[PDB]
């Protein structure tokens, strides 16, 4: 059953966001979403997101995912949005029949962790997820518990909160 996207007031932006310190590779240490469940029959494997900062302050983004038979590489463009640390996908704005996305860097210290909020307008509904990013594949219990509390504050129950399994293939 449907969990609505939270109001943007509940999704803070990191203060004094430094786009040139947020660049580089991040591992998805945690993932929570309104359409993501923990799947014990096929537990999510760790994946990675690489942020390349461009001269115009967009990010060219590479997503690296481990599939059974290959490494998958997907590509996005995060274009500067309405606030520092907010981006839209491919520069496409919110519109009443239209596929679009939003990105918000909620919290980060740049050299260890981040939490990032993502939302898309998909088939006339809002789909959202939060990544707990690490510069390494492991983070402290404390940071994971903070991610759990933030995820819950957005209305996500516990079985919508996932910790992808650390692996070496594809993401190194």
């Amino acid at each position: 059953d449907l969990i609505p996207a939270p109001p943007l007031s509940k999704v803070p932006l990191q203060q004094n966001f430094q786009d040139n310190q947020f660049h580089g590779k991040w591992y998805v240490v945690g993932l929570a979403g309104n359409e993501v469940l923990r799947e014990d029959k096929d537990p999510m494997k760790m994946w990675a997101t690489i942020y390349e900062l461009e001269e115009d302050k967009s990010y060219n983004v590479t997503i690296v995912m481990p599939l059974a038979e290959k490494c998958e590489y997907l590509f996005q463009t995060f274009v500067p949005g309405s606030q520092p640390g907010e981006f839209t996908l491919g520069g496409i704005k919110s519109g009443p029949g239209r596929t679009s996305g939003l990105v918000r860097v909620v919290s980060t210290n740049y050299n260890q962790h981040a939490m990032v909020f993502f939302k898309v307008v998909w088939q006339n509904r809002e789909v959202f997820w939060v990544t707990l990013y690490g510069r390494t594949k492991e983070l402290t219990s404390e940071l994971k518990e903070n991610f759990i509390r933030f995820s819950k504050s957005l209305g996500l129950p516990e079985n919508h909160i996932v910790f992808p399994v650390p692996i070496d293939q594809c993401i190194d």
Binding site: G33, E35, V36, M44, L74, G101, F118, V120, W122
Partner: peptide, 25 residues
């Protein structure tokens, strides 16, 4: 004329509990 599919990266959307490209149909 050329067909230009509208696709985005999503965790969810066309596939619950999976992250990948979803294209609007």
């Amino acid at each position: 004329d050329t067909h230009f599919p509208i696709c985005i990266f999503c965790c969810g959307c066309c596939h619950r509990s999976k992250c990948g490209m979803c294209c609007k149909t």
